[PDB]
Design a protein around this motif. Structure first.
Motif, PDB file in Angstrom:
ATOM      1  N   UNK A 162      87.330  53.727  40.481  1.00 15.96           N
ATOM      2  CA  UNK A 162      86.542  53.978  41.755  1.00 15.96           C
ATOM      3  C   UNK A 162      86.349  55.424  41.862  1.00 15.96           C
ATOM      4  N   UNK A 163      86.733  56.384  40.630  1.00 14.44           N
ATOM      5  CA  UNK A 163      86.727  57.583  41.246  1.00 14.44           C
ATOM      6  C   UNK A 163      88.032  58.034  42.002  1.00 14.44           C
ATOM      7  N   UNK A 164      88.912  57.075  42.180  1.00 15.52           N
ATOM      8  CA  UNK A 164      90.136  57.717  42.809  1.00 15.52           C
ATOM      9  C   UNK A 164      89.828  56.991  44.438  1.00 15.52           C
ATOM     10  N   UNK A 165      88.559  56.561  44.817  1.00 16.94           N
ATOM     11  CA  UNK A 165      88.479  56.253  46.250  1.00 16.94           C
ATOM     12  C   UNK A 165      88.221  54.619  46.475  1.00 16.94           C
ATOM     13  N   UNK A 166      89.368  54.087  46.749  1.00 19.85           N
ATOM     14  CA  UNK A 166      89.394  52.346  46.823  1.00 19.85           C
ATOM     15  C   UNK A 166      88.538  51.930  47.921  1.00 19.85           C
ATOM     16  N   UNK A 167      87.883  52.989  48.854  1.00 21.40           N
ATOM     17  CA  UNK A 167      87.036  52.463  49.812  1.00 21.40           C
ATOM     18  C   UNK A 167      85.657  52.479  49.547  1.00 21.40           C
ATOM     19  N   UNK A 168      85.145  52.956  48.151  1.00 24.96           N
ATOM     20  CA  UNK A 168      83.888  52.625  47.491  1.00 24.96           C
ATOM     21  C   UNK A 168      83.694  51.293  47.045  1.00 24.96           C
ATOM     22  N   UNK A 169      82.455  50.790  47.413  1.00 32.48           N
ATOM     23  CA  UNK A 169      82.204  49.205  46.830  1.00 32.48           C
ATOM     24  C   UNK A 169      81.891  49.314  45.312  1.00 32.48           C
ATOM     25  N   UNK A 170      81.606  48.381  44.635  1.00 36.21           N
ATOM     26  CA  UNK A 170      81.438  48.374  43.387  1.00 36.21           C
ATOM     27  C   UNK A 170      80.067  48.690  43.326  1.00 36.21           C
ATOM     28  N   UNK A 171      79.116  48.299  44.180  1.00 40.28           N
ATOM     29  CA  UNK A 171      77.719  48.827  44.153  1.00 40.28           C
ATOM     30  C   UNK A 171      77.459  50.265  44.162  1.00 40.28           C
ATOM     31  N   UNK A 172      78.286  50.952  45.121  1.00 41.04           N
ATOM     32  CA  UNK A 172      78.327  52.238  45.217  1.00 41.04           C
ATOM     33  C   UNK A 172      78.609  52.957  43.968  1.00 41.04           C
ATOM     34  N   UNK A 173      79.442  52.539  43.427  1.00 37.71           N
ATOM     35  CA  UNK A 173      80.159  53.215  42.059  1.00 37.71           C
ATOM     36  C   UNK A 173      79.049  52.814  40.902  1.00 37.71           C
ATOM     37  N   UNK A 174      78.614  51.778  41.055  1.00 37.88           N
ATOM     38  CA  UNK A 174      77.493  51.565  39.942  1.00 37.88           C
ATOM     39  C   UNK A 174      76.366  52.259  40.164  1.00 37.88           C
ATOM     40  N   UNK A 175      76.010  52.522  41.349  1.00 43.43           N
ATOM     41  CA  UNK A 175      74.535  53.170  41.826  1.00 43.43           C
ATOM     42  C   UNK A 175      74.956  54.792  41.389  1.00 43.43           C
ATOM     43  N   UNK A 176      76.145  55.349  41.525  1.00 40.03           N
ATOM     44  CA  UNK A 176      76.525  56.620  41.228  1.00 40.03           C
ATOM     45  C   UNK A 176      76.592  56.746  39.749  1.00 40.03           C
ATOM     46  N   UNK A 177      76.979  55.739  39.011  1.00 44.50           N
ATOM     47  CA  UNK A 177      76.917  55.859  37.675  1.00 44.50           C
ATOM     48  C   UNK A 177      75.248  56.055  36.931  1.00 44.50           C
ATOM     49  N   UNK A 178      74.588  54.889  37.579  1.00 41.28           N
ATOM     50  CA  UNK A 178      73.013  54.954  37.235  1.00 41.28           C
ATOM     51  C   UNK A 178      72.686  56.541  37.707  1.00 41.28           C
ATOM     52  N   UNK A 179      72.906  57.142  38.882  1.00 37.56           N
ATOM     53  CA  UNK A 179      72.559  58.686  38.807  1.00 37.56           C
ATOM     54  C   UNK A 179      72.837  59.417  37.750  1.00 37.56           C
ATOM     55  N   UNK A 180      74.018  59.291  37.299  1.00 31.25           N
ATOM     56  CA  UNK A 180      74.699  60.009  36.561  1.00 31.25           C
ATOM     57  C   UNK A 180      74.017  59.928  34.960  1.00 31.25           C
ATOM     58  N   UNK A 181      73.810  58.758  34.882  1.00 34.78           N
ATOM     59  CA  UNK A 181      73.178  58.533  33.143  1.00 34.78           C
ATOM     60  C   UNK A 181      71.701  59.059  33.487  1.00 34.78           C
ATOM     61  N   UNK A 182      71.109  58.688  34.233  1.00 35.01           N
ATOM     62  CA  UNK A 182      69.794  59.183  34.593  1.00 35.01           C
ATOM     63  C   UNK A 182      69.624  60.531  34.684  1.00 35.01           C
ATOM     64  N   UNK A 183      70.598  61.418  34.689  1.00 34.11           N
ATOM     65  CA  UNK A 183      70.530  62.875  34.708  1.00 34.11           C
ATOM     66  C   UNK A 183      71.124  63.519  33.562  1.00 34.11           C
ATOM     67  N   UNK A 184      71.434  62.470  32.429  1.00 38.33           N
ATOM     68  CA  UNK A 184      72.057  62.890  31.215  1.00 38.33           C
ATOM     69  C   UNK A 184      71.719  62.751  30.102  1.00 38.33           C
ATOM     70  N   UNK A 185      70.334  62.461  30.128  1.00 34.35           N
ATOM     71  CA  UNK A 185      69.389  62.325  28.929  1.00 34.35           C
ATOM     72  C   UNK A 185      68.683  63.546  28.543  1.00 34.35           C
TER      73      UNK A 185
END
Ligand code: HEB
Ligand code: NA
Length: 88
Positions: free
Chosen positions: A65-88
């Motif tokens: 969770x990026x080191x932040x256990x207070x994040x939800x799985x939904x937040x982490x996965x949404x962040x991954x979606x952002x990262x992937x969308x910006x990395x093509x």
């Protein structure tokens, strides 16, 4: 349910960019196409699972969770979606 990359940017900025904006200590830099191509091919399910669980790969340590256990799985996965969308 489905990823929300726009909502994901808030999590990315606060919890993920610290390593992934510049690519420090091995983190694949957002926007670095060569770094991301084989990772994207793993698919979102695997990227998000490895991001929630944490792992150590050929490049460095990706903390759970990026080191932040207070994040939800939904937040982490949404962040991954952002990262992937910006990395093509
Ligand atoms: C401490 C620093 C850091 C931090 C904070 C982070 C935070 C983060 N991150 Fe990280 N990562 C990292 C470090 C990091 N990271 C690294 C180093 C890597 C790489 C590993 C290997 O080796 O590969 C990653 C990796 C990674 C990936 C890829 C996976 C695969 O390929 O399978 C992803 C998607 C991510 C996400 C993320 C997120 C979403 C976040 C927020 C929540 N990540
Ligand atoms: Na899948």
């Amino acid at each position: 349910s489905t990823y929300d990359a726009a909502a994901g940017k808030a999590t990315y900025d606060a919890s993920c960019a610290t390593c992934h904006k510049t690519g420090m200590m091995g983190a694949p830099k957002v926007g670095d196409k060569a770094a991301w191509a084989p990772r994207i091919a793993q698919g979102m399910n695997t990227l998000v699972s490895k991001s929630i669980k944490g792992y150590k790969g050929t490049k460095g340590m990706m903390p759970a969770k990026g080191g932040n256990a207070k994040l939800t799985d939904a937040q982490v996965g949404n962040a991954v979606a952002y990262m992937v969308g910006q990395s093509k």
